[PDB]
Write a protein that binds this ligand. Structure first.
Ligand SMILES: OC[C@H]1O[C@@H](O[C@@H]2[C@H](O)[C@@H](O)O[C@H](CO[C@H]3O[C@H](CO)[C@@H](O)[C@H](O)[C@@H]3O)[C@H]2O)[C@@H](O)[C@@H](O)[C@@H]1O
Ligand code: MAN
Lengths: 232, 225
């Protein structure tokens, strides 16, 4: 399909178009990328992802067209542990992408010590962070192996939902990420990326989270996505 | 997804979201629901269907909601025969539906000699004369039809639409010259189809054939109150 759109104002249990991976599953009409005990609280050493069944025709060489697309979602994070971890992330990878062996923890079930595009919302520590301020969370644009090729200071607000909007326009190869809270608190970051130089014409779009030594929930509450091939 | 929506201006060779069943394949950036030869000509004994991977939530007994969708598409039909048969038909069956056994001939690969709705364009021998566009709700094939005109090689733009607000399923098939055909049968979809369904097409030809070419297809569905 040149064009594809789908939305989940909410995440009821009887899902069908979502490829749950890892501890991923539905509870309380939402998606827990990270595992969560019986009482709802997050556990440790948990990782999970979910993709949308239908693949998105990212781009097409035969017609020199790239997909102009938008991704709107919302996630709230919760955890007793004073400093939740590690983070959630919207990614775009090849269709057959599966959780990389040992990609848990600060890798967010995405990478392992690929070919991907991602907009991760980290909250873990890095005693060497070279593209952010470690002693403070961050939103990072991950292109291929290069993690956070551009970041923006963020804030982890326990239990509070964060409405985000990932929009990529091929007419500029401009990927914008606008995340905001309930009280107008606004966090953003843009970055020129040529989706073609890093992903196959056909990909899969979805989310990933993870927790290692420490934890937090990564409740995916709503989502919407649209992509359309544009000449050029 | 409470709302699903997709569009294929055309059908290239690299389709990742179509469940090809039977002999349906892609050729000339279109879907050859029925099979053709190396010369691209229709043949005998054959049925073919396609489905859109992503299931469509047609209604929700929970929120008691019903999906308000819409499906447009175009096809043409070629055969060296003057009485080419049997036809192509848009449908909505459960996610597991797969070409029924011995469903060749006029069964369009949609009926065995289920739960499914379908807008069929029968060209074969519902006025047992002129072709007809029929609405097949579940097992009752064609509970409402309208004479139709087969025009070899001519595209037929079709707009099947369902509205939970009146449960009216409307079909509007028109040609280049403007000739328009329409039909619309009341249908409490909840009555025959599970909440989760798949959409797609089907066609076939037994002893009389033709080419069932799906050239494009747009679909959108959104649950409502
Ligand atoms: O339409 C005029 C022509 O009709 C021809 O009749 C065919 C024969 O009686 C015999 O072969 O049976 C077929 C129908 O059976 C199969 O084909 C139809 C159509 O493809 C299909 O619906 C059915 O399920 C089955 O597969 C007749 O069409 C023949 O009499 C010609 O001489 C005549 O001009
Ligand atoms: O759990 C957060 C953090 O804890 C410690 C390690 O397990 C890291 O890999 C992980 O990112």
């Amino acid at each position: 399909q040149d064009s594809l759109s789908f939305g989940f104002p909410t995440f009821p249990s009887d899902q069908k178009n979502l490829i749950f991976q890892g501890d991923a599953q539905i509870k309380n009409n939402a998606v827990q990328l990270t595992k969560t005990d019986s009482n709802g609280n997050p556990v440790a050493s948990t990782v999970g992802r979910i993709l949308f069944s239908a693949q998105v025709h990212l781009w097409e060489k035969s017609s020199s067209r790239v997909a102009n697309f938008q991704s709107q979602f919302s996630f709230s994070l919760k955890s007793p542990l004073s400093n939740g971890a590690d983070g959630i992330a919207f990614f775009i990878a090849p269709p057959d992408t599966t959780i990389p062996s040992g990609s848990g923890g600060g890798l967010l079930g995405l990478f392992a010590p690929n070919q991907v595009i991602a907009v991760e919302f980290d909250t873990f520590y890095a005693q060497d962070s070279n593209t952010w301020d470690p002693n403070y969370p961050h939103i990072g644009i991950d292109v291929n192996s290069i993690r956070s090729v551009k970041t923006v200071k963020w804030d982890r607000r326990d239990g509070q939902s964060l409405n985000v909007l990932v929009t990529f326009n091929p007419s500029t190869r401009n990927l914008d990420v606008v995340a905001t809270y309930s009280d107008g608190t606004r966090y953003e970051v843009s970055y020129e990326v040529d989706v073609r130089s890093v992903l196959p014409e056909w990909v899969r779009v979805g989310f990933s989270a993870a927790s290692g030594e420490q934890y937090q929930t990564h409740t995916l509450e709503s989502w919407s996505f649209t992509s359309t091939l544009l000449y050029t």
